[model samples]
Target chain A: GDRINTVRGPITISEAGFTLTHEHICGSSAGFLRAWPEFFGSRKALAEKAVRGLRRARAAGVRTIVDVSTFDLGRDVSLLAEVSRAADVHIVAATGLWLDPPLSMRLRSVEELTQFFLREIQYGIEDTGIRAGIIKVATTGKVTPFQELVLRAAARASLATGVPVTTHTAASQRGGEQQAAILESEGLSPSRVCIGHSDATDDLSYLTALAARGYLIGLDSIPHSAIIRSWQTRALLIKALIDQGYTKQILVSNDWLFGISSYVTNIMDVMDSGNPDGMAFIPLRVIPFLREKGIPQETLAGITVTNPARFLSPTLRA
Target chain B: MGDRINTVRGPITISEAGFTLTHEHICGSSAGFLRAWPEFFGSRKALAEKAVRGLRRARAAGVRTIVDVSTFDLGRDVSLLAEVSRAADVHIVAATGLWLDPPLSMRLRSVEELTQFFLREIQYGIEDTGIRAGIIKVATTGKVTPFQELVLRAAARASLATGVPVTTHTAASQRGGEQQAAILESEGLSPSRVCIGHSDATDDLSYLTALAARGYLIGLDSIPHSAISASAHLGIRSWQTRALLIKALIDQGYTKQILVSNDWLFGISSYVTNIMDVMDSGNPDGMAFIPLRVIPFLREKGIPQETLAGITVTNPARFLSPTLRA
Candidate 1:
């Protein structure tokens, strides 16, 4: 199991396990439904799919994962429980609703809704028995009325639940600053909030500014696809972020969704893995695949391992 | 219509019969059985139904008019052209093409597809229902990606295909206003024909004066809904940004092309919900500048109701005359 456990709470992960600071591993709704609409239909198959996926993670050296999918946006706490039990991996769940889209998601306010969100951390979502280790926040490209409420509510829940909050900043430049101000205003601890996709903007100065403000940056732009051409510029941005003393402040992972890659004629040939130009969209992995070029094992160990455990703790460090 | 039009357009009454646009009531995406939508099989029916209700709102407003320029995301809302105009006694001019630059995810790379939008919205609306589209709308957000030339090219041709004039959505954050206008001009859209929306949110003034020099109309709408800090909410930010933009425009002698409308998106569960809505733009402490705030600011600025009429009723009425009461 990934090494993390609170002494009082009795959470524990032992031995050396690679942790992906950022990962998009949850099954897409369509993919899960396409294969098995009802959970009863092919749960054996679903469980196997999760096991096999985790097995691949195990092979890739990821021992624990912060499964960042928000509630009802395919959190699938049931499957997460199943995977958590079988995979020999600690799948820490994220509790906050993802922002913007799927915007229909309620921003918990009623004591009941807020309590329900807290319960996910206290006792796992919907009684799946796999507790959410963190909360998630998201904003539209521009902060809106809803984002403020969502952030405020998430802050309140975090305060009550004692669960850390991770967030997706708007994919644009203005997005990070606006969301950051909201968190600061809400009086949420900077360490409790992890801003995902700090790699979206090409501006190094901005990334440094965020890191200076002490937000844990999630550079999860790992998977490459033509659809994410806008995000492909993420490479230089991450390197620049790291260069600006943001490495420990950062987490990295791949948002790789499979089966969309065109093979034969390569109809959607814009980005296909392993082909000569295949890795064109994916830039950061070159660091992983290569020996010395990659972030040193110790540094990688910290971001993927020690850092997240530290992040989950009650006391936030500046 | 909340007031009367008295500017270059004409004198007309806007009844309290309501539904003053927070911008964009669209048409022109109707090649299907359902209006403004294709592939109406599943979850889409609700959207179509919602749109039908919008037409109903126009009918109820007793002012059969709206600016439906949602652009990039419009599924074509023009099917009600004849029906709304005739039966509802509404003046429904379809929205002329939309978003011209970056953030237009999947776009028509060719001028023809964009032209198809402009041509149909302009000529077809007139030909079919005697409802002429008042303006061509082009909007964009985020920094103009270096790859914006393609969109600029398409927008230019759309403008040329139909002389309905143009409007744009420019970010209040980045240099998108200046950049988008430059792109359009290079691509052949005359600055006079374009209006820039959401320009009040930025710290840049040169961007505005330059665009105004280009003769592009600058829209400072949505007087609220800006950044939230511990000390501020949309109410504060909206008024602050709106006042800043108004003062800059007035000082530049660019009030003629300066337009004021609400950049508000209603029912949004975010900041504007109820928390920010209570603040009034009429309040000087950087409160929300909404409809309740508009008339007061006009009065505070020592502008006569005629000029206020010009800002509210006249400008839009003039821009819209080619189609609605044409």
Candidate 2:
């Protein structure tokens, strides 16, 4: 049985059941959560609130939740561990830089970035003994030079550590292709990578091409409203991918956070209001919609459970 | 009619703040890093020793003061600066404000809140160390962000309140200095009260001349090898190009507004290995680089000793001495 890393420590692949591939326990502008914890509320209160939300996900049969909050994205691994324990949910924390790389990290060379990522994966994040289970990298409309360096470093770190890599992409621009090409160039297998935010677009051609090449398609930005894209459209997109026999390549999540700092809390409040089910939205809403569209429960399980476990399990290289 | 500037130790007369390096750092890292991992920064004692050794070398070369333009986000440790100043016998002027990558706490603060914070550091003390900040340092890398604009406005208001001069870290290739100047100018800050830093990173004398003609002091800093990549982008590949730029500015009768120094870091927590390596090989002279390396090069280029003094001594003395507002 293969083992995968989690905030609580390594667990067997079977324990990583009913997984939510892309989500965050807490999110803030890079460095905010660490520097100003009071902005999010007291740690005790924040953890309690997160545990309640995560408990709801547990009630909906979510066994493991991948928290893709990186260092620059205000990741709090200590708190993540606390919440994971309290919620009885397995949380896989992330290691890597986010979109707006700080000057300190921006000045670092590709090799240095690789070593930093390796340190987090192999050793631990900062002084915390809690190690990262995945590497997260991101790209905007197009890959800037700094973004390219992060991608290359993430690829190398993934290769060396055997940890899977996930990405944030402006899918409307098909930025996933650029991310995949860079990672593949660095000898990372597509099977070990997830092209996140693939749900942002309904363009089946882009989704199919990446899926055909063995990359995991993260239909993760499942919003409750049609303000961006209707939930019906996203559900239809998932159905079409399943129709094309790519069920094993599709992963589902809502990319929601249990807590966010006050600065961006107002902006996320609208989305939070629309998606009352929170992390359980996929099980409570999307699955029911897909089942009515003639998709079976076993197919949904393969996407939610099998795909995430396989993608997250490390594959050591020779 | 008398004016005084704040050093890490205490306020000093304009005459006491002698030949100065407009920009340099004894130590810098992400905020709160030094305390979190003092061992990673080679211990405060070791950093102080390295800084003392560097400052003594600068003292031997006739330098008396250095503006540690490292900001709050860049880990401006007032206590250490005071210790380094007393140990090396060099007047260390500390700065208040934020650097290029502002943490979310700083970004979320309103302009008024930022101005008050900077004011407190200038008038009261930094971290209650009683070592008042002498300058307000703000930065813009390639382009000025909206938050950077907010910081610039805050810096302007703080300077207007205290009469402390505002200095900036600019992307010279992008002519980010002009944008900084325009924002400060719009905030009612006089050009004479501002120093556009890293001006020599560009070989474009026209751009430098325009700023100087408008009365903004030109910081011909970044004399070390660390700034090679930035200067190289604008065809300024050698120290000789830096000398030529200064000589040209002097020829245009802007000698009184030129300040020169190396933006050297004797100790920094970010990129410890690379910074240590750079400390040894890239800039062996440290704070003494301007006097030991650049001055001789300027002398060879036919710059008179007196004009060099004005750039080094008089320009800094004038720029740094606060013109306290009513």
Candidate 3:
């Protein structure tokens, strides 16, 4: 019964191997696919394109992908389910609302929101019969009134449904602690909450304090930062976190998108030529990069395999 | 003489809300569209001034309470509303809710999330303007979408928590109010606390009769004339229709449960290419349509003066009266 709701339905937790914690299969403007499918390209065609990339990721020994594409970001689980089957990988989908709270949602209460997430976890997501495996919540530079409510909803939903909560941070703003405080106050263990985009900043002390508090810190923006600074920096940070014995709580992913994002036009340049293929970046580039830096094989496995498996394992239903 | 309700200028009593115009907009846009693309709107100062002029005219018309139904998605600016209320010396009741077609960002929000946003707007004042919303607006099309239903439930939740009443837009001819009432009822919201708006858009007296009979406040707010050309059809129903239906309600015993408004906007920058296009729909009386035209027209139709006063004055005061003390 310890199964994860991947895009292709449930897979036993042991079957989950070499997991990538956060990324997108389809990134979109909210309701873009419903409104202007032809403009974005046909659903079938987009799904096909996604399958090709996922096949590459699958080929690279990446057995599972947690696609944190929430509603506002054009999460296409129906498309992703097919991709999972075609590419032969487990694609875990998310259930929580996105970063920006829209007008209609600005006034929603936390309990009402919990029911929505609870339904996706307990029943299914949007009549698709595909339950979400994890909860995703995001915040801007500073938390707004609406963002705070969303964070609380995520915490309440996770605690209620046994789903893991992954967060997006304006890492430069260092709002991860605030996110941790809110979720922790809700009685969620720091281990159950992931403060994402932590790798965006080189703030070791910040990451250290968060890991010290028992929270999982996500170094999701890998190769993108590699060329901007150096891939060595990200590798070093992970090495340091591992050295500090936070390995059990670390999760890694490229946060890459297989399809076109509604906001960004050139995905290639957006990744800045350091290593554009995200699926390939971690496997082909970062893994070797870490090996060359003398991080042992088993420690790399913890960041890639064991840690993600543990972080994404469904837990207590409070 | 006052248990206060939040006005843009702060709080006023139910009695201070004399001759209230319960539905109108100072200015509205397509939610975050203006903020995302600011060039679509004219200067804020000019828009605020136009709002000032409209409220001044309403104040002159003996209107004391103006409930602006411009929701968050409709570019609701309580700061501007507060300024206009102060300059015009009329109590402006601002709204905290979502309009019918919300942005993509909000369409997927949970009802609880939306309720939190609405409750916070009502309790804390929208975005630190210190002007709390006195009402929540939820809307539906001829057929309610899942998102619309989600919004209605959230509205009920916010209303239950904060004592803010919900005002609505409906495809009135389709009896959208019945569906709205059913959903809100499921949440245990009192029919008396919710205003079923746009009842005037239909001549179908049965729909109005059914909703009012259940104790929901009926808003015969569409005035002057039909704004949409399709409103001219059989299944669809307008200006004179509102009068006749309201007259019929008055003919019954529902006068104390009725409220009237213009549903007008001084300046609205939304899906319309020009503001005049909206004005062209009807309303030769403009905001004064109720006092100067509809009231006089109903009086001529033999509705009692005290009954008209109740429809315009006492009924709205009662429905908008906060069920829980803030």
Candidate 4:
């Protein structure tokens, strides 16, 4: 059994069909937005902005964004649908619980949640008239009470939904055993779940351990990145994950939430310098640069479009 | 050693006359209403509908009994406030929270200096004069940002003069917890007499826990319900380590003192509600998915109902009730 936890599905993004499997099209982190919704200002403005951006992506031959940001607090789908329409980009959004716990913590049972998700599957595809690009799943680091719930729920979703599951692993390859054990127990295949944020680990042994188990490894966090700090070292670890026979199983993305400012003093320097505007160390940068370093476009495509698409959405080829 | 935090100031934030408006009006009017009519940029109908929609959303989400916590928040929707109470099925309890943040830039408008300003704003209902206020709001931020020492002192004076308690936002990552405590305590305000916003990122939990222990409360908003788990994303919460930390903190007796709140802006319309909004600093994208992410974890992870209820329901109700007037 394989169920993917990220990527809300079944909607046709307009422009190019190529996918950016790990990006946020429209996140509803309503809590953080309360004080500053005006900073985002109007949805009309957002619509205009997204249309322009999508047009740009179109020119660049970029067609899809496999948006993995899920629902728990900030997850909503209606607006995502709108962006897909305006920009003419194929947007595969996600709807799943967080791998971590929150203060309120009242979740539907995995069985119950499965049915709730089933509606998204049966109708989400038809409602938008497109089958879900892929399934999304998540896993916690070692395992908290909440992570355990996620694991069990993920396992159940995989078994019932028959969708490929993706995970947000805790720092380090520490999530390897934790996730593997849970998936094995659930009688689910590891092929469907692509463990994300795997770059958090420093040890090669752990990365290899995970790759050896047939789980796709995510090398999304390149150093000089805001979410993760170590780039050169993470690159070493990425090389290690690759050396360990995890190439086909490896995927990458920026995990970028465009225009997010932090409470930390140097917030702008961290985010602004990495997107369409600022080009310091971004996935777009890393991929083209990788191409120059004797890696083929196919390899980059596997990590960006192909590999993630293979595990997350069988409909698209890398 | 007075590296205090500079923050917003408050009592409630709605009423002009130092009256407590706990769940009152403040920042952010949504762009959603504009969707109804494409032609109107300065559309009064759009604006008015947006106003009523907010109040109705507020009431439906169970924030009816609010002591509005906004000020220094320009262009108070007083007319909108009255419409909610009189016509839209919302209970706009009035109060005044002191605010010295952006737009207005008026750091000090005291009880005596601007008493009439307060009186006039409260006089015209939400729709009539387009003036409305519910509670008072006050805050401090950063590592000794600026001016809040006197601001807290002023709010205390206003609270005493008006029988309203003072509330404030402390610099989240700085000495705000200790400094706000020092300022309020210096003004002879009790821990129970203040609402400290954004206490989740304090320098140390014990110090704030002591405040909670001493009856001071934290607005550990449920906004970034996940970033709290960011440490774990880095493999920081190894099952062994986190269990140890939880058990250790429990041994130190902090579970009861922690309260849960949504601090959510109602712009997105999730499956549920009870989220508060209005920024402390000007950060535009502060929202995180707490209601959707964290609470579900509490349920799946075996956190009990009573404990969860206390974080959400019990604590907010206990802190906000006020004295009645004829």
Best by DockQ: 2
Candidate 1 segments whose C-alpha is farther than 4 A from its true place: A1-10, A13-16, A27-46, A100-113, A225-236, A257-286, A289-295, A316-318, B1-326
- Residue B137 in candidate 1, Cα distance off native in Å: 37
Residues B152-195 of candidate 3: C-alpha lDDT, one tens digit per residue: 99999888887779999998879889989999999989998899
Residue A277 C-alpha lDDT in model 2: 85
Model 4, C-alpha of B162: deviation from truth (Å): 12
Assess candidate 3 and give its lDDT: 0.77
What is the model-wide C-alpha lDDT for candidate 1?
0.52
Per-residue alpha-carbon lDDT of model 2 for A21-119, expressed as tens digits?
889987764444543454456567778878998999999999999999887667878889999999999999998877755566767789878877887
Model 4 alpha-carbon drift over 4 Å, by segment? A1-17, A25-28, A39-58, A76-79, A99-101, A106-141, A223-245, A261-266, A274-284, A314-318, B1-133, B136-326
lDDT of 1 at B312: 58
Local distance difference test scores for all models: 0.52, 0.83, 0.77, 0.47
What TM-score does structure 3 among the candidates reach?
0.54
lDDT tens digits, residues A1-318, model 3?
667888777888889998889888866644445333443356777778678888888888899999998765667677778888988989999977776444434554676567667767877665478889999998887777777778888888888767899999988889898898888888888778899988888788999999888888998888667555686687678878888888876787888876654543445455536555766568777788778878889888878888787777788731
What order do candidates take by TM-score, descending? 2, 3, 4, 1
**Clashes per candidate, residues 3 or more apart or on different chains:** 20, 0, 19, 122
lDDT of 4 by residue, B57-154 (tens): 54544343333444423223343344444554444444444343322112323333334333333333222343333334566666434555655665
How does model 4 fare in lDDT? 0.47
Shift of residue B249 alpha carbon in model 1, Å:
61
- Flag the better candidate by DockQ, 2 or 4: 2
DockQ-based ranking, best first?
2, 3, 1, 4
